[PDB]
Amino acid sequence: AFPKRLEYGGHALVWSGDWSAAGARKAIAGAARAGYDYIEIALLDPWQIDVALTKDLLQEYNLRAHASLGLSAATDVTSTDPAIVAKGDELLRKATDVLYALGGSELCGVIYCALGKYPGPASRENRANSVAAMQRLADYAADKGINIDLEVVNRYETNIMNTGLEGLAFLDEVNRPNAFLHLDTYHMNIEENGMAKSVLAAGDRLGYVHIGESHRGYLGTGNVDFASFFAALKQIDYRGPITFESFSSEIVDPKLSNTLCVWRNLWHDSDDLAGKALEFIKQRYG
Amino acid sequence: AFPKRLEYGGHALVWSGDWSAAGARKAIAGAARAGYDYIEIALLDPWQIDVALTKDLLQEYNLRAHASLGLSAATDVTSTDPAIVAKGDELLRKATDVLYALGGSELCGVIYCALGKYPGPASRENRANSVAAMQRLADYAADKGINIDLEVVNRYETNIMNTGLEGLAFLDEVNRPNAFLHLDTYHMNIEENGMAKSVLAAGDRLGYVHIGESHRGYLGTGNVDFASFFAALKQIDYRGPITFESFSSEIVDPKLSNTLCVWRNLWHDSDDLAGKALEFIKQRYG
Ligand SMILES: O=C(CO)[C@@H](O)[C@H](O)[C@@H](O)CO
Ligand SMILES: O=C(CO)[C@H](O)[C@H](O)[C@@H](O)CO
Numbered sequence: 001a002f003p004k005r006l007e008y009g010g011h012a013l014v015w016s017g018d019w020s021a022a023g024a025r026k027a028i029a030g031a032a033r034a035g036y037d038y039i040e041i042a043l044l045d046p047w048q049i050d051v052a053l054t055k056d057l058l059q060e061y062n063l064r065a066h067a068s069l070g071l072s073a074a075t076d077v078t079s080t081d082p083a084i085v086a087k088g089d090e091l092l093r094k095a096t097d098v099l100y101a102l103g104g105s106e107l108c109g110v111i112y113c114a115l116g117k118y119p120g121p122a123s124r125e126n127r128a129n130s131v132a133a134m135q136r137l138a139d140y141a142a143d144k145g146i147n148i149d150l151e152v153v154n155r156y157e158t159n160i161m162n163t164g165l166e167g168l169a170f171l172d173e174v175n176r177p178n179a180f181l182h183l184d185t186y187h188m189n190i191e192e193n194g195m196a197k198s199v200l201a202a203g204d205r206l207g208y209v210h211i212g213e214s215h216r217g218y219l220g221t222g223n224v225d226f227a228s229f230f231a232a233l234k235q236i237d238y239r240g241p242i243t244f245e246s247f248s249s250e251i252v253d254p255k256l257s258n259t260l261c262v263w264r265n266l267w268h269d270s271d272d273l274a275g276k277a278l279e280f281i282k283q284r285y286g
Numbered sequence: 287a288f289p290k291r292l293e294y295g296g297h298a299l300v301w302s303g304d305w306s307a308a309g310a311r312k313a314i315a316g317a318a319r320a321g322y323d324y325i326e327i328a329l330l331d332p333w334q335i336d337v338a339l340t341k342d343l344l345q346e347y348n349l350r351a352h353a354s355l356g357l358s359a360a361t362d363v364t365s366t367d368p369a370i371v372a373k374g375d376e377l378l379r380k381a382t383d384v385l386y387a388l389g390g391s392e393l394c395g396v397i398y399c400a401l402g403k404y405p406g407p408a409s410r411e412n413r414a415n416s417v418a419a420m421q422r423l424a425d426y427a428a429d430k431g432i433n434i435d436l437e438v439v440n441r442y443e444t445n446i447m448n449t450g451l452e453g454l455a456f457l458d459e460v461n462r463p464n465a466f467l468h469l470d471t472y473h474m475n476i477e478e479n480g481m482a483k484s485v486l487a488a489g490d491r492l493g494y495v496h497i498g499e500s501h502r503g504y505l506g507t508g509n510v511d512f513a514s515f516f517a518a519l520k521q522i523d524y525r526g527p528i529t530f531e532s533f534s535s536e537i538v539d540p541k542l543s544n545t546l547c548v549w550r551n552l553w554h555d556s557d558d559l560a561g562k563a564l565e566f567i568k569q570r571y572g
């Protein structure tokens with residue numbers, strides 16, 4: 001395992017829908033202004049990122065970076081098409097290379113399949129293909145001091161693992177020291193039998209956390225049982241990244257936002273949302 | 287507005303993935319056995335149902351019927367393709383005709399758009415086309431003593447209305463006395479600011495209710511705040527259909543199950559699930 005600490009982050013889409021020079025600065029300035037320790041960069045196309053520009057911004061604002069992504073149909077490592085798995089392998093290596101160049105240590109999110117709606121259930125072969133790709137990625141990342149964190153997401157976003165317990169079985173199949181479970185309270189609110197079971201089962205295997213409200217808006221305005229969740233994190237003495245994640249039609253990443261079906265305005269003022277989110281989380285954990 | 291009564295129902299997919307002669311008898315006998323007042327028949331293809339045989343089964347088991355459906359891409363009444371809207375109008379007329387023939391009075395579900403994951407947000411034209419379609423359907427249904435109930439569903443299943451408050455603004459534009467809001471606790475768990483706000487706002491305009499757990503399995507084994515939801519129903523003295531809705535990979539409807547991304551086995555025993563659900567609901571309402 002590469003070093004993890006208790007640190008608080010904001011997902012780029014709280015502030016910015018692109019990673020242009022302007023968009024990168026808007027997101028990094030926004031995270032720093034609210035007092036976050038790190039920005040989580042959305043790396044859906046890691047060839048698009050200006051690495052030198054981004055490193056200069058992280059140094060300018062004294063901010064750390066982690067990275068998350070989802071694969072697409074063209075890069076789906078669950079595919080029975082060996083050429084598509086190979087394109088997925090290539091994108092994940094590029095994402096790892098970008099994160100390394102930014103001095104980051106965490107590549108998280110839906111790195112194990114195409115993010116979005118599958119037309120049917122996953123086969124044993126789809127799952128086996130994903131596990132092998134995550135072994136190859138974990139080994140590549142390990143050479144660069146990077147941990148990979150497999151995000152459990154809801155049924156509309158993957159057919160591979162929708163609960164923490166399914167995620168832990170997948171993780172154990174990957175069987176690599178720098179691979180961890182990533183839990184997201186928004187996804188857990190749909191799929192889990194309460195908000196404690198998966199955290200208590202994970203213990204030291206839990207390597208990354210996303211804090212999202214039931215509707216992905218302001219924390220404490222939805223249905224998520226944060227009290228039970230933070231009680232469980234305390235029980236396992238979780239000391240890893242905690243990212244505030246929120247999506248509003250106010251700020252659109254043309255790819256990610258439509259894949260995540262962000263039809264509604266849940267907020268308009270990024271600074272107010274992000275400030276209140278960090279206060280909400282620190283009141284309950286730290 | 288045609289008469290509504292407080293009555294408890296089971297969705298057909300609790301028992302049968304198809305509405306064959308055999309599937310219909312299994313589902314109707316199952317709903318009767320569990321002590322439900324009605325079965326909710328899924329009419330995604332209303333030409334597929336043997337109406338006379340179903341009528342005989344309803345009489346045989348002393349059961350009532352209501353109907354729900356979702357449209358598909360080919361029948362999407364939000365489409366800017368007038369030929370697709372016409373196919374949707376035709377499907378909804380046929381569904382109304384089947385419901386009338388079964389002596390039912392409620393056509394509910396995702397009747398105002400294609401059920402499933404839109405690749406992008408709805409245009410003003412998409413919303414206008416949906417409103418107009420629901421006016422034409424309401425007027426057709428009114429001639430056969432049928433109410434229509436527009437089911438608010440989550441972002442992954444419609445881009446038109448994801449909260450009760452959005453549904454009520456939509457119904458204001460429809461402006462038909464036999465058009466009602468339909469709320470579903472599974473969808474509310476994702477999209478709503480708590481489980482009361484939309485119910486209190488709807489009052490008499492709430493015409494239909496689905497009871498679904500957060501993961502669509504056994505009631506009480508997920509995250510839905512049923513205490514808050516049933517309290518709100520009591521506060522408006524809701525007197526209309528309440529249908530238990532649940533999906534497991536155990537019982538598959540080739541189309542609907544994959545649209546709803548039902549990847550997991552949440553149950554195997556239809557009678558245990560349906561009996562426990564009815565007891566769960568009656569202990570908390572009526
Ligand atoms: O909640 C849902 C879909 O998620 C159901 O109630 C469907 O709308 C209905 O059409 C199934 O028959
Ligand atoms: O919860 C998520 C998706 O629903 C993930 O955090 C998201 O896909 C990230 O990969 C965005 O960078």
Ligand SMILES: OC[C@@]1(O)OC[C@H](O)[C@@H](O)[C@H]1O
Nearest residue numbers: 122127159160161166549550
């Ligand atoms: O890998 C796919 C999988 O996790 O999909 C969900 C199922 O519940 C589980 O048994 C697996 O088939």
Ligand SMILES: [Mg+2]
Nearest residue numbers: 338339341342
């Ligand atoms: Mg007869």
Ligand SMILES: [Mn+2]
Nearest residue numbers: 151184210245
């Ligand atoms: Mn997340």
Ligand SMILES: [Mn+2]
Nearest residue numbers: 437470496531
């Ligand atoms: Mn429903």
